[PDB]
Symmetry: C3
Subunit: 130 residues, 3 copies
């Protein structure tokens, strides 16, 4: 039983990994809120989804890509000329081997720190085990 | 086998619970389209996801939060200065006990009434039973 | 039975055509066809599908992307921005499917973004339960 769901507390920017440290669910402790990465332990098929809210009132564009190890497996953008709140979200189904790391990487722009509202989220779970 | 998927027919506003009464799937009849809430019967881990379309041509901001019982477990915002259509969407994986209610509540703003087109949606299913 | 797929959009789409997600990352069992952009059901049961369609930026203000079962709209989504900014038409569904049923993502007006290999616009899904 592998499943996790965490939210983003603090604001982020640039090209850094998003540390979702508002952890709500973490069966097996395979997600690390100190690095914001999900480490695969059992080979198999996994679903991941992420929602990243852009910082409002400061900036027009923000990118958030889901990476496996050091390869982009999903890309997303939030854009608005009037600096409005908008979401960079995406979902993936991937096969993972032991040691594989899955995380959400910013690719430019500013993310919102939602404190306790859990605006920016990272969630996932194993569908099938090999 | 617990799983459901329902859409929103009527427009909503303010801070009311979103009653997705255009029901497509409801294994176990655990979702109530009359209250718009999903009642847990078996303790375990559950996936939920929601997409709420903002009312266009009237208002600039709309909030939609996924609440468990009476606690926010996900927040979302749609915002556009030009009153354009935009989405407040989010997903969660949570542990649930029997009697727990999970639903999508507006937290300010105006929601779009999509009739039968299923623009605004709420779906979910159990991953693991304890 | 392990039934699951996840594909991204390489080329641009527009009008009212089905989105051919031809950047396939996962396709256990080959029930999704990237040449038609359709998921054909073989095993009766309950399936989760989700799609994210990025609107084309700098050209157009509105875009629709609907998830269709057979030839029936089972989910609709819109992306809109007056300043022609990037925005998403995304949605998720849980549906019961019989063998032969086709599930795909169709544009319903507007222009979709071609992300090449970046996987900006995506279509994914998987079986939860088999009958
Ligand atoms: Mg927008
Ligand atoms: Mg990128
Ligand atoms: Mg404007
Ligand atoms: Mg709130
Ligand atoms: Mg606008
Ligand atoms: Mg968006
Ligand atoms: Mg339509």
């Amino acid at each position: 039983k592998i499943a996790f769901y965490a939210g983003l507390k603090r604001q982020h920017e640039g090209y850094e990994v998003l540390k979702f440290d508002d952890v709500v669910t973490n069966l097996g402790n395979h997600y690390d809120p100190t690095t914001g990465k999900f480490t695969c332990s059992i080979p198999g098929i996994y679903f991941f989804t992420y929602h990243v809210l852009m910082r409002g009132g400061d900036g027009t564009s923000m990118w958030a890509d889901l990476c496996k190890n050091n390869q982009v497996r999903a890309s997303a953008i939030a854009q608005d000329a009037d600096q409005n709140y908008d979401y960079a979200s995406n979902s993936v189904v991937l096969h993972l081997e032991p040691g594989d790391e899955v995380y959400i990487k910013l690719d430019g722009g500013k993310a919102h720190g939602g404190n306790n509202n859990k605006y920016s989220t990272f969630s996932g779970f194993i569908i099938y085990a090999d």
